[model samples]
Target: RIDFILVTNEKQKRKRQAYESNLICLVFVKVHAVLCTYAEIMHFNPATRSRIVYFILSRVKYQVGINRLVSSGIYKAAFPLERYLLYREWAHPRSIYKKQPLDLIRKYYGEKIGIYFAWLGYYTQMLLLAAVVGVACFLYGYLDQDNCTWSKEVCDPDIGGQILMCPQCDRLCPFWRLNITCESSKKLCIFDSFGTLIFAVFMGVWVTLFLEFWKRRQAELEYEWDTIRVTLCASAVFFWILLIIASVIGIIVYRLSVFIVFSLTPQMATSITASIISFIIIMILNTIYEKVAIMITNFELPRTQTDYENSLTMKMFLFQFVNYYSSCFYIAFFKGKFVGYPGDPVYLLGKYRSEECDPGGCLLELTTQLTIIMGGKAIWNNIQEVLLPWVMNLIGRYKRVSGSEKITPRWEQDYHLQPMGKLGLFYEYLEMIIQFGFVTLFVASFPLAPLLALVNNILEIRVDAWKLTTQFRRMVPEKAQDIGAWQPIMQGIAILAVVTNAMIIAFTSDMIPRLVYYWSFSIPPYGDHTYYTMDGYINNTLSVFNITCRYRDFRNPPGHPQEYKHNIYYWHVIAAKLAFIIVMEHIIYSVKFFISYAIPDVSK
Candidate 1:
């Protein structure tokens, strides 16, 4: 029995040793498989490969743990493999491959192929529009040049040949009637009033359509606040640069041209000097306007809540008010100005004299008219022309404001929201009001206005500093809380002034001369006895095609064929259009400027 027990013990020991060795080999093999799987995943070059592996491992770890528990005789705690398989299938990278490929392909192809085709279609449409406009302008010019006539008349026998009767009247005719003659002038043909009206309508439509498209696209993109702000700022900067360059080039060109002519008369010299000075001042003022807009948009209204709805309303109010006020001011101060020396020389200069019109009276009249016209179609036009830009800025500002809020660090709050004194508040209000006034005046007067504004602002800044230090008391605990919400309201007023000035210049400038003339025709009876007859005709022309004639009908009857001469310079038109374009572009850039400066430093 002792020998049998020893043999059994020896056999049991060998079997135990073999079992231990097998377990070690199995562990080694399992470890090697795991290492090999890790190596394969690590070797993945595309960064997304790591994400896929991580997703798989997170799920696999739980699966393996549950399996081990079940194998350890924990039947009641056994994992549901079906449930785990469902979870894994839903969570795995393979699920993404199965579901997202079609969607991703559709998006890529739509943006790439569909967008390209859409752009091509838009370009073609624009080209077609241009062609149509060109043809219309040409046809109108031809008709005006031809001096065509359309009229009817009759004569009476009882009266002298000078007397005539209408054939349509069914009255007895006594005198012979002559057909009214028609004459065409080159100046009249090119600058007719009808042309100006058409041009205005066309531009209005084009701008409105383009702006609408831009707004819709922006909405569709679901652009983040930072991107929107950045885009606006970039746009503002681009337009400002373009304005500066254009102004410089224009100045150089004008100076060179004047120098080459070198006229010696006092009138000539005075006129030339005035023109040069005016041009320089206008350019400078426009530049200043751009700078102010950028600063205000970037610094003041960088962020807002409920971006699109709030912004659109604020901008519209701002732009329209400014435009209305500026227009009224211009009409009050500058319109109906009489030029030339006293007495009959006034006849030579023109009918309207600036000195005679009462500025206050004109303003009152303008205000009353505006009140009457401040509803329906008229008001809507004002909103479209004047307020649309501000609305766009508001949209951009909202984006940045919201974006800054998102990235702002919690710990930085205390550092940002230091309280201000009573003096500070006082100074801030004063400075803001002064800036507002300066912008308004500068836009109205251009060079003179801007120069004065610069001087005023210099003093205003100092006064503001004093008020901030001495008068205002600290109240708000939040850093970056808006202490001057009203400032944007004032700035909006200033922008209105700019829009008004642009509209006035566009309508009144000599570049668009066709706006001035009234055309008419006359009919006369043949000479004989007592009876006489006459008829009248009226002219229909485009405002943009009118020529401002300096000479006393020098090309009138028996001297030259009446045709519109291309004598009116294009400089004024170019300036006005450029100014409008720049303002639009500037608003775009202000968005970016606001984002970069206003967004708090995340790392800090």
Candidate 2:
């Protein structure tokens, strides 16, 4: 079954030929870091062997380079050999419960994939802390149900039952009852409590901790001059981003237009419907934008592979950031903030009235927006990764086998499997990074997001492992220092997270307004109450539109000099909100700096 040779020799012609061959070999030997030799070959791990081979192939110049050669059909492919026995031991789906044999993987697959798995593992490990803290925050709100006496007041017959709120929109929009929001108010309490503020602060620190720890782990794992054409590419990208924003605006108009048509709670119907549509648009646009983005990259034509990826990374990431988070950003900061008093509501494009959030805040709407996008994205992406390939792989094999041929070779079978695209890892990185955005960017609105993300990632780790080990053709293993582009991209997100979360708590959640009410508005000068309390918060917060009807706002009640205008309480709450943002940002940023400085990149 096996054969070997221990020795060999030469002939009469070899005497002359061997001398010339020796000189040629000696000249080639100079190509090194003392160019790789016999002992090196014997001791080198398979991953290193593959890396060296690929490196040599890359440097080889017959058709300019091996990449060009492969592209030109001189070679059908170039990839590392696989070891199925080793794969089955840990990397395969059957070994799903087993810890990844990362060292073994590094020795076999090269450091690029090794580091991806490394970061993924580290990411999953880090979520444990966030998830536990988040659950604690959730439980605190759940148990503090009795303390949300505001919701009780909202539900009480004499209080909320007797209150008549003004219409939200035009004639078709009917006046609503305050008690109608009682159930939602209780639900909001679950996310819009003091606990949420604490959680937001915790998440700000948690993001820094995850990032810094990743650097240390990256060390253990051993693993952009742009210019637009530059105008053409940047202009093209900006145009597309504007298109996405336009679509976001279109969805808002739809919500405003549809508000009156639905007989039920219009915000809920419109929010869910619009969110679903937005998710679909996001998925479809991603498919279209990917091609367009790549076309732009190709058009620009960067000289090096590094330059190519770095360009695409920033473009795609920026586009995706807007596509996914735009709705949430709108809800958290823009939605209710612009809507004027009930008598003179703000209008979009001088036609449709600007959308308004619930009296409490836009936190509820944002929670809905995030839930749909995050859940749908996870499910849809997994379907694409899992189902699309197996079906295509089946069809390809079926046709190839039926096409008539000699007995198919093992290599042919392997070749018939899916070809991992040139940007395969890029997509994988993009998904996790977007998920990271969801986890950190709006964790205040949806505390359970980390729990959801944690679940998704656990499955994602296995799915990627199974897909890599089973469905895909062997990838050409390339050396990497760490997750490229993504490192700084994530760092950028962490920094951005602090600002966004602070704004979310300050403006989107009802915390600051209620805090203002409890400490300032409810005390002596402003209230009949003798002590700090939230006793009449619901009634006090609702400004009367006329003697007959009231609306949710911090405006002067009817007959006041500044009737229907922002009152002192509005300015007071605004100041408090700004103060909270500045204070929280400073405190969180300081801790982030201290933590990053304190953590050593190399563990003791």
Candidate 3:
């Protein structure tokens, strides 16, 4: 009986150890092979033993599909046998008592690639809708030019200079008639009048895109519902407050500037100033929208509030700081010129005798001589005395915020979501209108507007970078990498600028000759038989045109091949390409003005 009991115990032990033994044997075989190979290849180094062991263990676990051990809890057991069996159960395909069919559902559904495809489809549809609406609005404006006359007649006096009958009312009237009509307005039909409609469509599409993107993002954030909601609310509030403050300050400053520049009676000033201020404000706002602000508005923050707030504050501070510095730089460096007087008369004599002096001596020499010798300094001093207090007042007001806590902390919260206030909404709408208005105005003036805009944009990027780095201390979110959403809007503005420039050059080049002749006649009467006539005027105009066209062609020659070979290629190539296209297009369009004048037939 004792012999039988011992034999039974041995049998139970062997049964329990079977799976573990097999797993250990496989692990040992792999390890042995690696060790033998290493020993043959090089001298054995005890220092490398730990690393080798770790490397072998990692490979073993990976090959054995070790994740199964997590669920089995066999890894938690102190016993080697239990751990071995756990690994074996996971690694061995048919170790289970019963076999089940594999999970084929994942195979049928493909993978995340399909989900991405679905998203692409949705976005594509939305884009198509926007495109359709945009095209329709453009066409509407282009086609409806006839009924929309630009002129308005304010007053019409009869030859008798007495009573007149109104055309619209056909009544017995007393005095001269004043009729509001668009019959005489020049180039004020579709392009000018339909701006509002085009703007409406643009806004509609933008809003739709915003909502759709927001909804999709909201769905994603649902998993972390509490955290996401809080973040969103906090961020929204922060941004809205910032926008409101910016708008108020912008409007007030703009009005003040206009009032100061253009002096007028109080009542007249108010109306004229208001109109100018409104136009300027709209233009500035639109610029911001197209360049930076719009994308910033629609961005969705994550559940992490600290991360979001830090990023937002940094961006805001950077943007503001950059703008301020850039404005300052432009004012200080480029806006004015300074000239120094030489101690000797040699340089002065040279300047006076030079052909350059035919137009005028150096501005510095003229200014110095006038001020120093001709009592100009006394006049200047008197003027300065009068202006001193006003200047001081301005400085004092501007410096009020100086030396204050530069790092003002925003309202801290667990989440970063907030609603835009009334002012914020107003600013956004104002900004959009201004952008389009400015484009239209500049387009009307000259083709060089777009070229100027391109230069401004290029400078803006550098300015913005400096602003981001120096002014704001915050980590930028990964999503905010594109530097704000209004990129496309800016591009649109740039495009509009190009088209406007094209139109202006086509129409205005001929007007230059007329302007020159007008000024020539205005001068004091002097008998000069070589006065500008139609023939001479045409020749001069053509000459100017040729010079402009030649300059343009030299700058950007068509069919010039690019060198494709590169030793090093950076990821920013795409951005560079886009910038190049925008700048080149503007430049090309601007040069077209000269071309138009050179070849009069082309203008027709």
Candidate 4:
């Protein structure tokens, strides 16, 4: 079968050189069937033929490599041909809902691509489990809405309306009433309720299941294919890291400045605007950082393609983690964590007072950040993926028509289509990995993240499939036994998710304080309640300040020997939060270990 072909111009004169003096040879493949030993001959499918040709192209010595020839302008381009028949069958929009033809894809594009779609499809399926669970948690919170005692307290004029909370900013922000946050507090109950706690632990176990299942699937692919086991300029990389930090700090200042303006209105204008601005900066910095990462990796001049890609993966992932997750991390862990007493508030740069979370808690702010970044990322990425190729192809067709279009040759027609650059799949993997982070990392704060991610991935798979078949040239088929660096990276993310979720539940959300109030603090020592309840929970949580105003903190009252210092309730809450973190982490980690061990990597 004529499975592989290469093209070169006929108009150019060529010079020949010989390895042995006065001897020249041309490269060719035999067409006639011949019987040979198993070592001498093997299967030759379309994919195998292209693989062999690529091997020869990369290694065959002329004056230099074929790729170098392309680089040096001696050849226009070199790529495997596309299978238009398969494209029409699997990649058309009409077949969008159909299951991916994994076998056909592996045959046409190679196992590397086959494995990606397989893993993507599998991940999406696993998310269904998480998403359903997530939606249930959300609904549980909604149904239990009327039973939220603290939220009711927050809205009560006697309990919350009578309290004057301390000012957030120094002088510009006025002492506000706690009841003003009634709406958000009610909403926060949906995400910070007991069901969310259960959901967070469920996700920890779910992530472990996701990874273990993927490993088995990967092993199955290995069996089917009989696959054998197969950076940067320092300053440029360093500068990007510095730039990301600076941008993060700039956002801190933005929040500090905006809070003063919005304090008068007492609406959550700061977090909303800061989140939007933070997302915009993240996207912009990502664009520039990508170029910098690519250039930095190229400068190191790795000896193999795999090394080049791995280095780029590490460098790129580092920047991306910081770029995307830094703000969320700050909101979850740092915001409002350091707001000192009203008289001596924490300052960012000796000028602006540090910002605080809503009177409800920091969980809502973290939820907002995740929603905007994750949602914005999905929307923007899909638009870019779909529109960029469509627009480029339209321009190409327009140019051809304006030049008096005729029946064009197939190769010429494909020549005008967009080129899939070297790092094509890299970007795809990076996008999904970041989304995976969002789905798992702060999921405790936003139960609907998996649902959002699942929807995007469904659209994403088709969008990628459509673009690959219709908009771009065929990629050179490459073999891969596994997903490479991404496996370990995801494993790392899965382990980290347990701690992040536990911490978010403990520190970021209002779960622990309310629990303490309900269980221990609401008893005789701290309250006059005869039984366990949340009757005076709002009043118990707020601390008296300046003899007249109260603040949302656990501190000793005025005139104490250690005035404004953390009191007994504060220490008790701290111990409880730490114990919760420790217990949750150990339990989740034990389950992860047991499940991963129970699930065999290879099925018998």
| lDDT values, one for every candidate | 0.30, 0.70, 0.29, 0.72
lDDT of 4 at 421: 79
Best by TM-score: 4
TM-score of each: 0.26, 0.84, 0.22, 0.87
Candidate rank order under lDDT: 4, 2, 1, 3
Across residues 1-604, which tens digit of lDDT does each residue of candidate 4 receive?
4323334444232422321122112233222111122214334466666666555444445431454455555445555543544444465444556777777778777766777888888888888888888788888787777767767777666777887777765566676777777877767778877878888888887887788788888888888775511123566666776876776675676676665565522454656677777777788878887887777767666554467567878888877888888777888887767755554556766865666666677788788778878888899898987777655334433344323223233555555666677675888888889999889899987788888988887878767777776677777777877888888889888888888888888888778888888888878886788888777777678677774376667788887778778988789878999998999889888887888778788867
Q: Could you tell which candidate, 1 or 4, scores higher by TM-score?
A: 4
**Per-residue error (Å), model 4, residue 166:** 1.6
Model 3 Cα shift for residue 525 (angstroms): 61
Order of quality (TM-score): 4, 2, 1, 3
Tell me the tens digit of each residue's lDDT in model 3 across 400-457.
2232223222222101212222122122222222323232323322122223333332
Better of 2 and 4 by TM-score: 4
Off by over 4 Å in 4: 1-44, 82-93, 228-241, 254-270, 299-305, 341-343, 391-409
> Number of clashing pairs, model 2?
1
What tens-digit string does per-residue lDDT give for candidate 2 at 374-410?
8778888888887866552333333343332223334
Candidate 3 stretches greater than 4 Å from native: 1-135, 149-202, 213-247, 258-305, 310-604
Q: Write the per-residue lDDT of candidate 1 for residues 194-313, one digit (tens) a residue.
A: 442353234333333422342343233223211277876576456545544444344334433554455333423533453444334443454455345435454535453224124423
